[PDB]
Enzyme design. Sequence first.
Site, PDB file in Angstrom:
ATOM      1  N   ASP A  38       0.756  -1.260   0.000  1.00 47.79           N
ATOM      2  CA  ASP A  38       0.000   0.000   0.000  1.00 47.79           C
ATOM      3  C   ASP A  38       0.779   1.298   0.000  1.00 47.79           C
ATOM      4  O   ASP A  38       0.179   2.370   0.082  1.00 47.79           O
ATOM      5  CB  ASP A  38      -0.997   0.044   1.167  1.00 47.79           C
ATOM      6  CG  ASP A  38      -2.248  -0.730   0.872  1.00 47.79           C
ATOM      7  OD1 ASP A  38      -2.814  -0.525  -0.221  1.00 47.79           O
ATOM      8  OD2 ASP A  38      -2.669  -1.538   1.721  1.00 47.79           O
ATOM      9  N   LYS A  85       3.019   1.812  -5.058  1.00 47.37           N
ATOM     10  CA  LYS A  85       3.678   1.300  -6.256  1.00 47.37           C
ATOM     11  C   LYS A  85       2.856   1.348  -7.539  1.00 47.37           C
ATOM     12  O   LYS A  85       3.318   1.838  -8.574  1.00 47.37           O
ATOM     13  CB  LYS A  85       4.138  -0.145  -6.001  1.00 47.37           C
ATOM     14  CG  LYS A  85       5.170  -0.263  -4.890  1.00 47.37           C
ATOM     15  CD  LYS A  85       5.551  -1.719  -4.597  1.00 47.37           C
ATOM     16  CE  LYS A  85       4.374  -2.548  -4.058  1.00 47.37           C
ATOM     17  NZ  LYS A  85       3.907  -2.148  -2.690  1.00 47.37           N
ATOM     18  N   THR A  86       1.625   0.871  -7.468  1.00 46.75           N
ATOM     19  CA  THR A  86       0.779   0.820  -8.650  1.00 46.75           C
ATOM     20  C   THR A  86       0.297   2.199  -9.095  1.00 46.75           C
ATOM     21  O   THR A  86       0.256   2.483 -10.296  1.00 46.75           O
ATOM     22  CB  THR A  86      -0.382  -0.157  -8.398  1.00 46.75           C
ATOM     23  OG1 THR A  86       0.172  -1.449  -8.097  1.00 46.75           O
ATOM     24  CG2 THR A  86      -1.281  -0.263  -9.619  1.00 46.75           C
ATOM     25  N   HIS A 137       2.488  -7.241  -0.852  1.00 45.03           N
ATOM     26  CA  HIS A 137       1.999  -8.160   0.167  1.00 45.03           C
ATOM     27  C   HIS A 137       2.865  -9.395   0.330  1.00 45.03           C
ATOM     28  O   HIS A 137       3.244 -10.039  -0.658  1.00 45.03           O
ATOM     29  CB  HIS A 137       0.567  -8.585  -0.133  1.00 45.03           C
ATOM     30  CG  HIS A 137      -0.149  -9.126   1.063  1.00 45.03           C
ATOM     31  ND1 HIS A 137       0.079 -10.387   1.574  1.00 45.03           N
ATOM     32  CD2 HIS A 137      -1.036  -8.536   1.897  1.00 45.03           C
ATOM     33  CE1 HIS A 137      -0.634 -10.546   2.676  1.00 45.03           C
ATOM     34  NE2 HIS A 137      -1.318  -9.435   2.893  1.00 45.03           N
TER      35      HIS A 137
HETATM   36  N1  LIG Z   1      -2.909  10.422  -0.299  1.00 48.75           N
HETATM   37  C1  LIG Z   1      -2.276   9.594  -1.145  1.00 48.75           C
HETATM   38  N2  LIG Z   1      -2.729   8.325  -1.333  1.00 48.75           N
HETATM   39  C2  LIG Z   1      -1.955   7.609  -2.242  1.00 48.75           C
HETATM   40  C3  LIG Z   1      -0.832   8.028  -2.931  1.00 48.75           C
HETATM   41  N3  LIG Z   1      -0.346   7.016  -3.741  1.00 48.75           N
HETATM   42  C4  LIG Z   1      -1.152   6.025  -3.540  1.00 48.75           C
HETATM   43  N4  LIG Z   1      -2.161   6.319  -2.633  1.00 48.75           N
HETATM   44  C5  LIG Z   1      -3.238   5.472  -2.174  1.00 48.75           C
HETATM   45  O1  LIG Z   1      -2.830   4.465  -1.276  1.00 48.75           O
HETATM   46  C6  LIG Z   1      -3.460   3.205  -1.642  1.00 48.75           C
HETATM   47  C7  LIG Z   1      -2.516   2.149  -2.116  1.00 48.75           C
HETATM   48  O2  LIG Z   1      -1.985   2.538  -3.380  1.00 48.75           O
HETATM   49  P1  LIG Z   1      -1.413   1.461  -4.369  1.00 48.75           P
HETATM   50  O3  LIG Z   1      -0.853   2.173  -5.530  1.00 48.75           O
HETATM   51  O4  LIG Z   1      -2.377   0.375  -4.672  1.00 48.75           O
HETATM   52  O5  LIG Z   1      -0.280   0.806  -3.454  1.00 48.75           O
HETATM   53  P2  LIG Z   1       0.701  -0.425  -3.789  1.00 48.75           P
HETATM   54  O6  LIG Z   1       2.009  -0.134  -3.165  1.00 48.75           O
HETATM   55  O7  LIG Z   1       0.763  -0.629  -5.277  1.00 48.75           O
HETATM   56  N5  LIG Z   1      -0.040  -1.675  -3.059  1.00 48.75           N
HETATM   57  P3  LIG Z   1       0.399  -3.277  -3.167  1.00 48.75           P
HETATM   58  O8  LIG Z   1       1.563  -3.471  -2.301  1.00 48.75           O
HETATM   59  O9  LIG Z   1      -0.813  -4.124  -2.859  1.00 48.75           O
HETATM   60  O10 LIG Z   1       0.810  -3.498  -4.599  1.00 48.75           O
HETATM   61  C8  LIG Z   1      -4.611   3.615  -2.587  1.00 48.75           C
HETATM   62  O11 LIG Z   1      -5.819   3.888  -1.872  1.00 48.75           O
HETATM   63  C9  LIG Z   1      -4.071   4.841  -3.279  1.00 48.75           C
HETATM   64  O12 LIG Z   1      -4.995   5.736  -3.875  1.00 48.75           O
HETATM   65  C10 LIG Z   1      -0.359   9.370  -2.734  1.00 48.75           C
HETATM   66  O13 LIG Z   1       0.607   9.906  -3.261  1.00 48.75           O
HETATM   67  N6  LIG Z   1      -1.158  10.105  -1.798  1.00 48.75           N
HETATM   68 MG   LIG Z   2       0.329  -2.467  -6.263  1.00 48.49          MG
END
Ligand SMILES: Nc1nc2c(ncn2[C@@H]2O[C@H](COP(=O)(O)OP(=O)(O)NP(=O)(O)O)[C@@H](O)[C@H]2O)c(=O)[nH]1
Ligand SMILES: [Mg+2]
Length: 397
Positions: free
Chosen positions: A13, A16-17, A77
């Site tokens: 979270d 990354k994505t 994860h």
């Molecule tokens: N406020 C804020 N929220 C963010 C930012 N970047 C991502 N998020 C939020 O945090 C959450 C996780 O983002 P996501 O891109 O899925 O994270 P990840 O690292 O890819 N997750 P995973 O490890 O499952 O792949 C989402 O609700 C997303 O909108 C940011 O710069 N600011």
């Molecule tokens: Mg991701």
Amino acid sequence: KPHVNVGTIGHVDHGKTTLTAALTYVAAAENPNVEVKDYGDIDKAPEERARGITINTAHVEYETAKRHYSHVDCPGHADYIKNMITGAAQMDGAILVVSAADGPMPQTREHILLARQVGVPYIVVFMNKVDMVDDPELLDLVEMEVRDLLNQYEFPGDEVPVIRGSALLALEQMHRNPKTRRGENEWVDKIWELLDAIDEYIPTPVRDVDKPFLMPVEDVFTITGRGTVATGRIERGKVKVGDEVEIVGLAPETRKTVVTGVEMHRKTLQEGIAGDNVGVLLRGVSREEVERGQVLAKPGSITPHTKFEASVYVLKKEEGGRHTGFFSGYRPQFYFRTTDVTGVVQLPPGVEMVMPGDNVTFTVELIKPVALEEGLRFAIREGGRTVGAGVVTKILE
Ligand SMILES: Nc1nc2c(ncn2[C@@H]2O[C@H](COP(=O)(O)OP(=O)(O)NP(=O)(O)O)[C@@H](O)[C@H]2O)c(=O)[nH]1
Ligand SMILES: [Mg+2]
Ligand SMILES: CO[C@@H]1[C@H](O)[C@@H](OC)[C@H](O[C@@H](C)[C@@H](O)/C=C/C=C/C=C/C(=O)[C@@H](C)[C@@H](O)[C@H](C)[C@@H]2C/C=C/C=C/C=C/[C@H](O)C(=O)/C(C)=C/C=C/C(C)=C/[C@@H](O)/C(C)=C/CC(=O)O2)O[C@@H]1C
């Protein structure tokens, strides 16, 4: 424009994505060849969309004025560490995403250590979610903590670029104005800092072709009529149709065969080189003779072994390991390339146990043969925890 492989790693979270999506949109404003990708187009599987989690690694393409990039977005994860390792093995450089609101977490640490174990030579840092932090002191602290972590794992922590930004606000700005250009928006400019950083800090890769051929077997398929195909990423050297190769590891003895075909996606090749993800068609053998965990190699260049000495770093709880150490007789799982094999630990004379945080040496006897050689890096797992990261230092048997 030279091609370079990069990707995103880091704790679950942290962003990354979202950063991957932002990168495609920002880069596309300066290049009409880049296909923009929304968050849901990357985490596209029904299950990923349902729970907002990356399960499978995703591959996206984008480019800068200097290069064409293939970006592997990895899951953070713990349940999908196998997919993260698989993705990291393809990277010439990695983008470590760290949430400014949470600071380094267990997989922030574990991913750096594992990236090193798989050979990722450079890391660039994107401190994300700064839009959620109003305290400049906290941002400085998080940066210091990340640079310290990198240093701890032998990366040039004081040299690496640490970009402070917001993947979300940059992505939202690109959705509002897909033509936002350099200099116009603070969040988009932080994404440009990142694109410029990978361009200048991640070295143009040199494929490791001046070596005897070796490819770990990722999976095996039987193509009706064509034969047995072993897939994998060539680790070193080159393989050409007609080459004799040995299948080494796991089985009671090494087996020899001849390469009768090399393919990549829907392309027929006469040769594959280090860094290529290929399907290698093998003469005569069936799926009963080639399997995940074995390696294909230039005959005589690597041999099967069960006993070795290794230098191992014992992981602490905060890095994905445990608080307690272990003794002789410990029977964890060892992972070498695509192999998963149980082994028994024998500590040196006089050493009662080895503790987390220490770099130790010990001997291991595996329950099945594995293609081993000095310098081969590996990991040790027990109960779903990464308990050690090591390198083979001597072949005993
Ligand atoms: N406020 C804020 N929220 C963010 C930012 N970047 C991502 N998020 C939020 O945090 C959450 C996780 O983002 P996501 O891109 O899925 O994270 P990840 O690292 O890819 N997750 P995973 O490890 O499952 O792949 C989402 O609700 C997303 O909108 C940011 O710069 N600011
Ligand atoms: Mg991701
Ligand atoms: C059409 O049908 C079929 C199929 O669908 C097609 O696919 C598109 C296919 O197409 C082909 C032509 C072609 O286009 C497709 C080819 C596909 C190729 C795929 C290649 C890959 O995955 C590679 C990156 C990987 O193996 C990669 C190197 C492997 C992947 C290995 C992953 C291992 C994961 C283990 C996890 C542990 O629990 C763990 O918790 C832990 C912490 C372990 C750490 C281990 C370490 C540190 C090991 C090192 O010793 C090391 C150096 C590891 C790196 C390593 O070896 O990575 O054709 C078929 C016929």
